[PDB]
Every structure is written in structure tokens, then in C-alpha cells.
Design a protein around this ligand. Structure first.
Ligand SMILES: Cc1ncc(COP(=O)(O)O)c(/C=N/[C@@H](CO)C(=O)O)c1O
Ligand SMILES: Cc1ncc(COP(=O)(O)O)c(/C=N/[C@@H](CO)C(=O)O)c1O
Ligand SMILES: [Cl-]
Ligand SMILES: [Cl-]
Ligand SMILES: [Cl-]
Ligand SMILES: [Cl-]
Ligand SMILES: [Cs+]
Ligand SMILES: [Cs+]
Lengths: 395, 251, 395, 251
């Protein structure tokens, strides 16, 4: 028994060992209680405004749409404290954790942005934090590995599997299965067992709420489409949520195409995987014909995940949201273009959503369209990665 | 079939608990694994709990993780495990064979198709490690349709609703992860077997002493396989030395 | 002849070769014109809000003042786009440069934050940008050297002198002396010849204006003191300006003590230099007994400058503002403390102002005092520097 | 004294322009520099423009920058330059000696004290490179108090107010950084000398042709010193080869 619906259509559920169900039911009741509690909301609203920096700006790109009928705004989650949207829902989960009397925190991270957010939230609110990170992602996202460590958190590289996000998620859920007594597992995306995909959505939904209010104030109408990269799903559902019942508004999620879908080396299970049961949820995943979990790939650590949140699989299935993919090279060009023509250095994750928006403009330059790209993070963590790439390519 | 009933009726009337070893199929190789399992049986394993190597065993310690990577290094697939399983049942007609699976390997090509395959090779039960009773309905129906017992873990943090659901939904045996042994004998629940920390003869004995019907050595039999990868012949003898001792403690 | 007063008391002036005076007079008239122009102000206000992220938060530190009678807020210029306060006044100077029909930009930078800001502003507003940086600062502030380069700017390391900020300033003023025809010299601090100390103050004064409004809303009274690090003076005068006529409010500027004033290796000319003429201004500087410019030192590149803006020298002289110094080791502890107990990673520059605030609290823990620290920047650019330090110290 | 007047009265009545070399004092060494300056005089330099090495020459190209670092490597201080200056005036009673200074070296120990020191050693003029006429009042008063001519640069982007101020405030000679030569002879301004890009005999000639009273070789005499650091004796001969040629073009 649960208080809320654990599934989105066929997708979702609570596929955890029986031992963790009390933990999941306890988090769910605390969440429902908190959502009803004005003092929780006032406290969560206060941290978002006065500590994290909400509302974030909505920036109209003047230059990159020149000569087209595209008007492109960027929702500036890159300006949030910590450097990405991750920070929004860790502040809410941290308040929940204190509400439940927990004093430790467990987390996974691939781009290190969720690890940074978990660490800053735990430092602020006096929680002991430990974080699992892929040894591969320790290396390409090293600006975030230091940051986590000076904020008093334990970073635990994981060498199993593909040494990426998946592998940290596995470690973290193993850890919580024994430590759930005193620790809260602060899951970093809109995926995993219920209630996480629901909690993370509601603690991210301010992205879309603000975007709606800002685009109404600036344009007097809703966007034709909002566009977000999709790794586990939290930034995208955060942008989508408040627009779901605005049926004129398109919802476009962008999975990493990596080296190209036809290569098998990608992170696009929603459209190029098939449904399975893993990480506590029934969701599209990349898997062998045997049902072994395939390893994903993307130039961006934050999207290198072989599954996707169940609300996205559901929104896809009923046609409410469309999902597409953007390759490494496409994301890199969008990264370069934003730096040179708007003076914003975006996360390589967020570059995937920008890349698709640029394709929507360039393929149909006389199509009148008002677009919003969720710029999920800033790309300081990516500059060394982008350097060695463009250097090896003589650029 | 009726393999779990008859086993517990025989061990009861013998005044002995059940010793159920766990071992992952194909660890460290296929024909190597078959000789391990034969040797666990020779020394008096009352039943078997057998794992199929899975890509991401998010409810297993590092011993079983490497046990799995050992089998994948061997090239062990689910398909090859089922060919092993049919070969083990063909040698051993009465021993209960239980599978410990991950949900994706059951769900992958059809839940009914998996349990159909289980019956075809003679499997007696399936515990899906990451399927709680709340999510279990299509699994335990496919299980019961193909004469497979669905096994459920009774966790230490069990509340009363869970206890009755496990009693009602579960067949074959109950996997105990004093007050709880009380309450499963309560509601017509299958015989409880302790599985928390059984790697000595002295923890088997105690588990039988507390009223359980048996004990499951969830690992450190796989530590024996790990300790003797390069020494196959010595791995077998050291394996029998263990299970004989542990089964000696069962009584 | 000028339109505005070029001096603050005895300090300031326009000590440039005659060839650059037309350039300075032209910038001054354009500035005065722009300050009167509602359309300039509306454009400058729009970029600050929708591109840079103003207003920035004012964050109350819960943890680091526990057990004392100090209430400490941080003005979060670390949340501004680019990572520091620098971005505020480069957007205004860039608009001025376009107003003057200039199409190139020259800049100096030591912490790279002014170089980053110049580059992002030039990318946004279509200006060609070149930037001088100390070869020493190229190295300890390397996260910012990449960022400048992908935004389309030319970074020119300078090996003369101490290979620090001073040396880039020298190069930049030499360059503008020949290129002033088509290029604007976007000076990065409240120093140099008039009108720069005045322009930079007015284009930074929103820091203090916001701080006043925020502290009134949250506390119902003005701060007892506002505290800012002082390198050339722009963040500090930006915080001070709107409080100058609030005489109950203390104004505390913190110069880098480096290895300790008694060592000579510091960047505190205001209090431990003497008046000279250099970089177009009459101001305190560190200089030999011969009148050669001494080389400054600080662990933080942004403060490693041997002079200071003339309004600060004036505010000091009349007693309106007090100036103090904070050593490398003191700033490093404030850096560590903020990371671990508030989950904010501050710039090592800003750490100097935090360090003095922590001293004000700790020396007099029962003194009731409401303090604001201008957190001028985020410390991502410093994590590799702070790593090698604490590693060499077995920490 | 009256050294600049008498020089221009003699060059006029000789139908020749003034050739004024620049060289930084103590470049590359003190006694080395003194021999350079003697050699510039022997070959017919009509006056001298002499720089004092400054820490941060923000209005000087790299040639003079290294010229300064050469002198600092020699250990050349402002104090040592003034001892050089007194030694040069004691050898050469009539040659006008002009200093090109940075404001901090003038302001450092007292503006009046610096110009007092200039008179004491026989200096005739001081151009402060980073002091525009707008900031010049205390400098040109201390200069005129000690019988030193304050020199001001007349830039290419000169407006009319600047022209009159330079004419009124400046003594000795005007440092031109066709229409401007017009307007300084206008308002009783000291004789103009061209200083932009004179590193050939063929650019001296042209500057005299346009109506100026002379030309200043703002550098590339220091390029001769740079080109021959290791060859002192050859540096001197190569220096005379230059200045003789340039002074030959003065007529
Ligand atoms: C700046 C940015 N944008 C998008 C994503 C994508 O994640 P969602 O789909 O929004 O949940 C990420 C990922 N972050 C995780 C995974 O590595 C992490 O940091 O640990 C990200 O860092
Ligand atoms: C984050 C931060 N806080 C304070 C200062 C100090 O400069 P002011 O006194 O505020 O003008 C700096 C310096 N920045 C310059 C110098 O290197 C630069 O980046 O180029 C800084 O980066
Ligand atoms: Cl457009
Ligand atoms: Cl409108
Ligand atoms: Cl307090
Ligand atoms: Cl109040
Ligand atoms: Cs993904
Ligand atoms: Cs300084």
C-alpha cells in the first residue's frame, strides 16, 4: 500500500528488496506530510530564494537566432548555486531527511553536480554526506570532485561495470539497503523506485512554473515548445511539469546520441532501448537480448545512464512529449556556439537540449516558433574535457 | 511437483534442519560449476539456492558480484544456466532447486515464458530479489501457473501486514532475512529458513535452535570458489569440507 | 577640463600621456550622457536582470556564527553570471563602448574573472576582445583562461615584471595608447585615470543598493558594518557607495596581507605603502625608497596589485572607511570554513573579507553586531590552488 | 641658464635642424653609458634626451623596457643617474640636457626636490611622460622655480585649447608626437621637434623639411645598444656610424 500512485501508465513501481519498502513508505508519508505543511514550504521557499538564488533568469538569445523566425530563451539553471538545477531538489530532500530524523546522506553522481549539491546541502543543514561516483566520471568531471571534498563529504569512486553513473547508482542502493536506518538516500534524478520520480518532479517543478510566468511577462503567450536534455529525467520533468496540461505547448526531451545511435554507443534508452526492471523501476533501458543491462555512453557524464525516469516513458507513450537524440558532435557545436555568440558556457548535458533547439531553428528557419531551452547547468566542469577534444581535432 | 513438501517432511521426522547452500551458476566455469553443485549435494545439501549471473546485482555483496563477473568471464548466459539446470535435475530427481533471480532476467523475454522454462528444466521455486510482495502479483501467478513456488523474503523490519501477505502469497519456504518465527507459523506460512550471516557451523546450529526449519548460506561458499580459482581439485575438497561440516551442524 | 571631479581629496587625477586625454574625455562625456539616458539605463538594467541574474541573493549564515552575537549575511555576487561581481560593470562599459562606436575591447585581468566578464560581454554585444594576463596568473587561475578563449577572446600572457596583474595593466595601457582609435579599454577595477574610478563605482553600486534593501527587509535596520576585500577597489566601492552617507554604517575594506605585512610580501598599499603616481592615478602604492614600484604578493591573484583605487584612499584619509589586512593563512581558513559549514565555495579574494568578519566575531563573541560580507566571487577558479596548498601541508 | 635658446639660435643661423638622440642612462652599464653619451655628442648631437630607468614604463615600447631592465641589471638607480648627469654637464657645458621622466620618479621624494636636484646637476628640461598639461601645474612651477624648462608633448590628436596651453606652459622645445606646426608658431610656442618614427637618416630629413626645428630619435639608438651588448667596442663605433649619418641628414 502507498499514499500516491507509484506508476505512470505501465512505468514505475517499487522494485526494491522487501527490506527497503519501509524506507520508501516512510519517505512517501513524510513527503505527503511536508507538501501539506506551510512551514516546510516556507522553509523550502526561503532556501531556494536566499541561499540558492531563485528565481533564475530567463535569457533571450539575441545573436544565435539572427536571420530566422525562432525566438529562443534559455532558462538559466546554470545560475543556481552549485552550477546546476540539481541544487533545487536536494534542498527539499535534505529538509525531508531532517524531518525524518535522519542525520546521514547517501548519493550517486555522474556529472558531479548532484554530488556537489548533496554536499552543499548537507554542509548547510548539518548532515554527514557520502557520495558514489564512477571512476571514469571522477576523471572527466574532476572540477566537481574537489568541490565535494572541501564541503566535508566522502567521495567514493566506483570501478565496477562501466565505471559511470549506473555503477554509482548500484553502489548507492546497495549501501542504503543496509544503512537506511540512519541515512537518507538522496537520489539525484526523477527515476528509481517510487516515491523518488514523484518527489524529484515536485521539488524541481519551479523551473517550469517560473518559466511560464517569465515567458508570459515577456511574450504574452506560452512557448511553442520547451526543450530539455534527459539523463534520468529531473531537469526535463522540472521544466515540463507545469506545462503538461497546456496542450498547445510542445515538450521535447533530448537523449544523448553519443557517437550515434547506429553505433550502439549512446544513452538513449527511451527511444532506442526496451522496457525492463532495474534500479527499483520498470522503465525503458538499454539491455542485451539476454536482459543484461547494457552500458551507456555519452560525452557528457550527466547523461551517461542506460535508463530513464518512468514519467518520461509514460509521457512519450501517450504522445504528450516527444523525445529525440543529439550526438556528441552536435552537442559540442552547440557548446561552442553558445560560448562565442552569447557568452554563456553551458554544461555539455544542457548543450544537448540547445543542440536540438538549434536544429529546430536551422532546419526550418522561416518557421515562427517561440522556444525555451532549459539550460540545466554551467559548463565550467567541462572546459578541460572540451579542451582536449578540440585540441585533438586541431581546432 | 511436490519436492519442497517431501523434503521438509523428511527433515522434520529426522529431527534435523535444512541446509541450503547458495552458489551462482557457472562460477567459475560451466563444467566446473556442475562439479561444485554435485559436490554440495554429495555432502548432504538438502536443497539448492542457485543464482543466475546478472549485469547489475544491486542487492548482492562483492563476493557474489565477482562470482557473477567470474561467470561472465566464462561466458555464462541465462540460456546456459537453464541447460545446466536441466542437467542437474536429470541427475538429482528429488532435491529441491530454487532460483534467486533479478527481476529483469525474469521479465526480460516474458514473465510467463521464464517460469514456463523453469518448470521445463525442473526448477521448484523462484525468489526474485528486487520484487517485493507489493509488486509480486504477475510473478507469483506465472510461478503458480507453472508449478513453481514463489519465495518471499521476510525482512527483519517486518510489520504484521507483510507477515500475512508473505504467509498467503509464498509457497515452498520463507526466507528469513524470535518474534517473527512466532508469527509465520501463525498464518500457515511455508517453513522459515534463516539466511542472515551463515558462514560457520556455529551459526547454522543456532538458527536451527531458534525454531527455524533450516538455514541458507547466502555466500562464503562462493568465497571458497574465490579462494581456490587456480586450484580446481583443491577447491572441490575444500568445498565438501565446508558443507559437510555445516550440514553436520544441522542436527 | 572635465565634466566631473577627477580627484577624491588629493587622490586620483588623469596621469596619462597627453595622447590619451581625448580618449578619457570622450569616455567621460559618454558616461555622463548615458547616466542621463533612460534608454541606456533600461538597457543596462535589462542585461543585469535577464542576462547576469540580478538581484543577487543576500544569504544569512546560520552555522558559522553559532554561539556568538554576530549576525552575518553574505551578499552573493558569487551567483552573478561569470562567477564574480566583475560582470556588473563590464556590461555597462560594453554598452558605453557601443555608444562611442567602438568595436574592439582591451582588458587586463589577474583572477581571470575580469577577463571572463570582458569576454562574455564582448561575445554578447558583438565586440572583438583581447585580454592581458600575468603569466603567473595564467597558471594559478587556469580555469578562467580556457573560459576566456572559448568565448572568442585573445588571452595574452605577460612575462614582464612580477608576471601579475600590475604587469597586465601596464601592457593594456600601452596597447590602448596606440589603439584607442577603435578600441575601448575596459578597465577592470575602481582605479586608473579618471573617469574610471567614478564609472566603475557607479556601474557597481547596485551591490550596495540591493544589500541595503535586502537587509532592511530582513532585519529592519542598516548593517553595523559592510566588509569587502580590496584589490583595486571595485567590489568594495560597489558595496560601500550606497552606504557612504549612512554614517552609522561601518565600511571595512580588507587588503591582502599575503605572507604577513612584516615580510614585505603583501598587497596592502593603502595602509602599508605610500602615495605615488602610477597607472594614471595618484594613489597609495608599494614602492621602493627610490620610487620604483614594488611587486605585490597575495595567494589570491585578484588582490595581487601594488596600488588601490583613489576613492578608497580618500575614504580612509577622512576616516569614513577603515582598512585592514588578512593574511594568506587567514583567508584559507575562512575559505575552508565557508565550504564546510555553509556549503559555499568562495573566491580566495572574497575569503579575505570573510576572514576579517570571522575575526570581528571571534575576538568579541558577545558583541552584538549585524555584518554583511560582500562575497565577491565563487571559488571554483581556486580549487586546484587550494588543493596543492592543503596537500603540501598534510591536510 | 639659457642653453636651449642659444642652441636654436645657432642651428637656425646654420640652416640646419636639431638632432636630439634619446638614450636611457646606465644602459647597459654606468661607465659604458657615459662613453655612449660622449660618443653621441662627438658625432654632433645638438641636445640630449635622457631617460631614467623606471619600474613600469607604461608609455614605452619593449626596446626601452629592456633598456631599463638592462640598467637595473647593472644596478642603475635614479641617484646614480644624477651622478652621471653631473659628470656629463661637467664635460659638456653648452649642450642642452633634457630628461624624460615618469611622474612617480619626479613626485617620489618631493617635486620641488627633484627639480632642485636637476638644476644642481645642470639639467635644462624635463618632460614627464605621464603628466598631461591638465595635471602639470605643480610640475611646471617647480621646473620654472629651478630654471628647468618643462617640456610638453603636442600629440597628433591635438585640439586648439591644447595647442595654446602647450604654447603657454611649455619652455625650451615642443615635442611633436603640417597643420600643427602651423599653430604652434602661432602662439609663441617653443620650437617643435618631431619624435614619431625617426630611426633613419631619411626620416630626419623629412622632419626638417616640414618646418620643424629638429627631430628626436625616440629609440633604435637603444636598438644599437641592444644589438651589441657583448661587443662594447663595436657598439660605440656602430653608434657613431648612426648618429653621424642622422646628423648629416639634419642639414
Ligand atoms: C548540469 C546537468 N544537466 C542535466 C543532467 C541530467 O540529469 P537529469 O535528466 O536532469 O536528471 C545532469 C546530470 N547530473 C547528474 C548525473 O550525472 C549528476 O551530476 O550526478 C547535469 O549535471
Ligand atoms: C572574485 C574577485 N573578488 C575581488 C577581486 C578584487 O578586485 P576589486 O578590488 O573588487 O576591484 C577580484 C579581482 N579581480 C580582477 C583582478 O585580478 C580580475 O579578475 O581580473 C576578484 O576576481
Ligand atoms: Cl529571431
Ligand atoms: Cl508583450
Ligand atoms: Cl548568531
Ligand atoms: Cl524584521
Ligand atoms: Cs539516459
Ligand atoms: Cs591591492
Amino acid at each position: 500500500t502507498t499514499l500516491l500512485n507509484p506508476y505512470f501508465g505501465e512505468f514505475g513501481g517499487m522494485y526494491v528488496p522487501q527490506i527497503l519498502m519501509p524506507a520508501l513508505n516512510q519517505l512517501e508519508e513524510a513527503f505527503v506530510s511536508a507538501q501539506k505543511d506551510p512551514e516546510f514550504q516556507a522553509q523550502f521557499a526561503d532556501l531556494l530564494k536566499n541561499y540558492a538564488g531563485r528565481p533564475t533568469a530567463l535569457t533571450k538569445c539575441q545573436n544565435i537566432t539572427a536571420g530566422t523566425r525562432t525566438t529562443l530563451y534559455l532558462k538559466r539553471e546554470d545560475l543556481l548555486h552549485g552550477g546546476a538545477h540539481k541544487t533545487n531538489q536536494v534542498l527539499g530532500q535534505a529538509l525531508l531527511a531532517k524531518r525524518m530524523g535522519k542525520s546521514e546522506i547517501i548519493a550517486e553522481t555522474g556529472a558531479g553536480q548532484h554530488g556537489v549539491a548533496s554536499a552543499l546541502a548537507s554542509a548547510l543543514l548539518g548532515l554527514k554526506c557520502r557520495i558514489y561516483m564512477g571512476a571514469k566520471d571522477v576523471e572527466r568531471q574532476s572540477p566537481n570532485v574537489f568541490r565535494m571534498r572541501l564541503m566535508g563529504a566522502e567521495v567514493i569512486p566506483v570501478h565496477s561495470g562501466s565505471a559511470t553513473l549506473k555503477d554509482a547508482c548500484n553502489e548507492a542502493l546497495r549501501d542504503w539497503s543496509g544503512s537506511y536506518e540512519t541515512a537518507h538516500y538522496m537520489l539525484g534524478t526523477a527515476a528509481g523506485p517510487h516515491p523518488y520520480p514523484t518527489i524529484v518532479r515536485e521539488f524541481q517543478r519551479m523551473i517550469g512554473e517560473e518559466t511560464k510566468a517569465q515567458i508570459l511577462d515577456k511574450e504574452g503567450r506560452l512557448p511553442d515548445a520547451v526543450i530539455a536534455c534527459v539523463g534520468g529525467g529531473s531537469n526535463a520533468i522540472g521544466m515540463f511539469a507545469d506545462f503538461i496540461n497546456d496542450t498547445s505547448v510542445g515538450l521535447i526531451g533530448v537523449e544523448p546520441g553519443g557517437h550515434g545511435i547506429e553505433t550502439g554507443e549512446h544513452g538513449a534508452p527511451l527511444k532506442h532501448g526496451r522496457v525492463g526492471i532495474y534500479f527499483g523501476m520498470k522503465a525503458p533501458m538499454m539491455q542485451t537480448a539476454d536482459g543484461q543491462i547494457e552500458e551507456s555512453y555519452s560525452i557528457s557524464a550527466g547523461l551517461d545512464f542506460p535508463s530513464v525516469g518512468p514519467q518520461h516513458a509514460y509521457l512519450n507513450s501517450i504522445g504528450r512529449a516527444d523525445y529525440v537524440s543529439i550526438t556528441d558532435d552536435e552537442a559540442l557545436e552547440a557548446f561552442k556556439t553558445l560560448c562565442r555568440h552569447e557568452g554563456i558556457i553551458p554544461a555539455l548535458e544542457s548543450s544537448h537540449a540547445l543542440a536540438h533547439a538549434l536544429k529546430m531553428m536551422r532546419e526550418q528557419p522561416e518557421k515562427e516558433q517561440l522556444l525555451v531551452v532549459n539550460l540545466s547547468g554551467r559548463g565550467d566542469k567541462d572546459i578541460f574535457t572540451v579542451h582536449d577534444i578540440l585540441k585533438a581535432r586541431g581546432e | 511437483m511436490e519436492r519442497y513438501e517431501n523434503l521438509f517432511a523428511q527433515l522434520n521426522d529426522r529431527r534435523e534442519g535444512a541446509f541450503v547452500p547458495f552458489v551462482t551458476l557457472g562460477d567459475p566455469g560451466i563444467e566446473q560449476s556442475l562439479k561444485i553443485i554435485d559436490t554440495l549435494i554429495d555432502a548432504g545439501a538438502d536443497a539448492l539456492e542457485l543464482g543466475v549471473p546478472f549485469s547489475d546485482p544491486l542487492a548482492d555483496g562483492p563476493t557474489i558480484q565477482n562470482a557473477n563477473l567470474r561467470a561472465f568471464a566464462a561466458g555464462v548466459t541465462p540460456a546456459q544456466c537453464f541447460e545446466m539446470l536441466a542437467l542437474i535435475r536429470e541427475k538429482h530427481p528429488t532435491i529441491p532447486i530454487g532460483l534467486l533471480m533479478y527481476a529483469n532476467l525474469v521479465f526480460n523475454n516474458g514473465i510467463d515464458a521464464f517460469y514456463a522454462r523453469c518448470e521445463q528444466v525442473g526448477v521448484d521455486s523462484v525468489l526474485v530479489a528486487d520484487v517485493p510482495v507489493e509488486e509480486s502479483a504477475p510473478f507469483r501467478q506465472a510461478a503458480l501457473r507453472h508449478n513453481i513456488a514463489p519465495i518471499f523474503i521476510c525482512p527483519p523490519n517486518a510489520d504484521d501486514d507483510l507477515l500475512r501477505q508473505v504467509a498467503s502469497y509464498g509457497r515452498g519456504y520463507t526466507y528469513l532475512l524470535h518474534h517473527l518465527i512466532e508469527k509465520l507459523k501463525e498464518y500457515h506460512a511455508a517453513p522459515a529458513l534463516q539466511g542472515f550471516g551463515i558462514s560457520s557451523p556455529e551459526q547454522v546450529s543456532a538458527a536451527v535452535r531458534a525454531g527455524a526449519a533450516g538455514a541458507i548460506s547466502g555466500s562464503a561458499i562462493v568465497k571458497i570458489i574465490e579462494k581456490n580459482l587456480a586450484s580446481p581439485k583443491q577447491m572441490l575438497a575444500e568445498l565438501r569440507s565446508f558443507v559437510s561440516a555445516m550440514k553436520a551442524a544441522s542436527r
